[PDB]
């Protein structure tokens, strides 16, 4: 346990100056990673960890029409590693110029290989191994022998498949292997190859702040909302309240801003960080919005009509996720109401274009910040309204 993994990290740190090499996960996976091996990367499932590469025991020569032996690999420097009876690491790499001759002397075989559809169906990105760091036979201090030629680390180049096949040495981060036709229609299933969790991530940042509301005695929740209603209908009071919480004791503001701050201080008037932090977040969210939105928020809060917009904003943000993409959103039938409606204006004020005779509303990535700030504000006010 942990032995082979410690050797891998040491070798990479010493030999991988550019950070281009992928460490082998386990001594089990260390074999089969050879130059020209094809590995796959299936779609991810978490914001916080990436899937393994998987050598699919198929070689690039196997999918190229003239079925012939692969070109030579470049035998690189040998490296004699340190312990104080040794471990020697050698480099096998594919010369970048190999692909140019290979992909003209051979061409992707038509019909495609069986495996490619399987990988296409699963949304896999497909790569070819271009370099390996490998061993000769020796044991691990740990006791356990690493067989000769065990891959410690490797480099990859991405395959891209269209009417033909190409090997990309430096693809960008979003690059897909399986390209759509000019039609844009990828026949057969969702097989998305994408995923956002933008809205669900937004729901999380909001919830961190929201739970801190119930700690207020319901009167404090009450005084807080009334102070907010007042500053929502006063742009400069709102800004002054915002800037009071960006700072000794507190600035003695009167008015609705004072009503809000009075909820958040001690007898001494000193900082009360447990209280200010959630409020500063809410003030940050409101500051993102326009004056028209503020006065409507006060009206919705005083009228206790926060849900109707709240549900709609969340629907649209969830539809438009990822928000850097453009898309056509759909207004859920029944406000789940044309110009002049509070929600219409609220969404109009974010930069979106609504139509009364159409259910279509396209997402404007420029509205991403304001919409997210708008979604947060509605939720947090509702919580204090319980």
């Amino acid at each position, epitope marked *: 346990g942990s032995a082979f993994e410690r050797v891998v990290r040491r070798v990479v740190q010493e*030999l991988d100056h550019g950070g281009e090499f992928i460490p082998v996960t386990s001594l089990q996976s260390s074999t089969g990673f050879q130059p020209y091996c094809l590995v796959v990367r299936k779609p991810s499932s978490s914001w916080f960890w990436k899937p393994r590469y998987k050598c699919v025991n198929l070689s690039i020569k196997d999918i190229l029409e003239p079925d012939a032996a692969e070109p030579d690999v470049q035998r690189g*420097r040998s490296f004699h590693f340190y312990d104080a009876t040794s471990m020697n690491v050698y480099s096998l790499s594919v010369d970048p*110029n190999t692909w140019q001759t290979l992909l003209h002397e051979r061409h992707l075989r038509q019909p495609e290989h069986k495996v490619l559809q399987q990988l296409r169906s699963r949304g896999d990105n497909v790569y070819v191994v*271009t370099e390996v760091l490998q061993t000769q036979k020796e044991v691990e201090v740990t006791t356990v022998t690493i067989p000769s030629g065990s891959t410690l680390a490797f480099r990859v180049a991405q395959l891209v498949i269209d009417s033909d096949l190409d090997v990309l*040495l430096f693809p960008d981060k979003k690059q897909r292997t399986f390209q759509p036709p000019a039609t844009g229609l990828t026949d057969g299933v969702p097989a998305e190859g994408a995923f956002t969790e933008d809205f669900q991530g937004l729901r999380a940042e909001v919830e961190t702040i929201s739970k801190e509301l119930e700690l207020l005695d319901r009167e404090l929740c009450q005084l807080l909302l009334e102070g907010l209603e007042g500053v929502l209908r006063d742009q400069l009071a709102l800004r002054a309240l915002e800037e009071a919480l960006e700072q000794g004791p507190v600035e003695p503001l009167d008015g609705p801003a004072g009503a809000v701050l009075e909820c958040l201080v001690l007898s001494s008037g000193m900082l009360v960080p447990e209280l200010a932090i959630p409020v500063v977040y809410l003030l940050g969210a409101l500051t993102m919005l326009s004056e028209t939105q503020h006065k409507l928020l006060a009206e919705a809060l005083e009228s206790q009509t926060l849900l109707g917009p709240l549900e709609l904003v969340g629907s649209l943000l969830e539809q438009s996720a990822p928000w850097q993409e453009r898309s056509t959103m759909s207004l859920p039938p029944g406000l789940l109401w044309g110009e002049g409606a509070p929600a219409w204006v609220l969404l109009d004020e974010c930069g979106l274009e609504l139509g009364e005779d159409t259910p279509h509303v396209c997402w404007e990535p420029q509205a991403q910040g304001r919409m997210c700030a708008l979604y947060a504000s509605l939720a947090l006010l509702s919580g204090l309204s319980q």
Partner: nanobody
Amino acid sequence: VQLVESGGGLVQPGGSLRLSCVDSRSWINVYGANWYRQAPGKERELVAALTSGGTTNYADSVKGRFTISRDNAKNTVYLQMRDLKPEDTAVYYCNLERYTGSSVYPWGQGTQVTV
């Protein structure tokens, strides 16, 4: 992009040139760089090698006349050429070699020097 080789040209014996190997990315500044040359009718010939650390090594035919250096902010590895002779006439290419000895890019168009 890949390596962009420029600065070549036509001169007469004894002249001097300076060729440029430019990398849009920063691999040129983290790895080694070499200048090669494929002389008319003759095979591609390595001219100068520069390690990531800056250690220089040259071939016998070019000692005392050629100097290989690096400008990080310009992502450029240069080939200062002096006392150029028609035996130096060729198209000059550069390449990058990692610490493991693997090459980073395929060849660019190169730059022709003709003396």
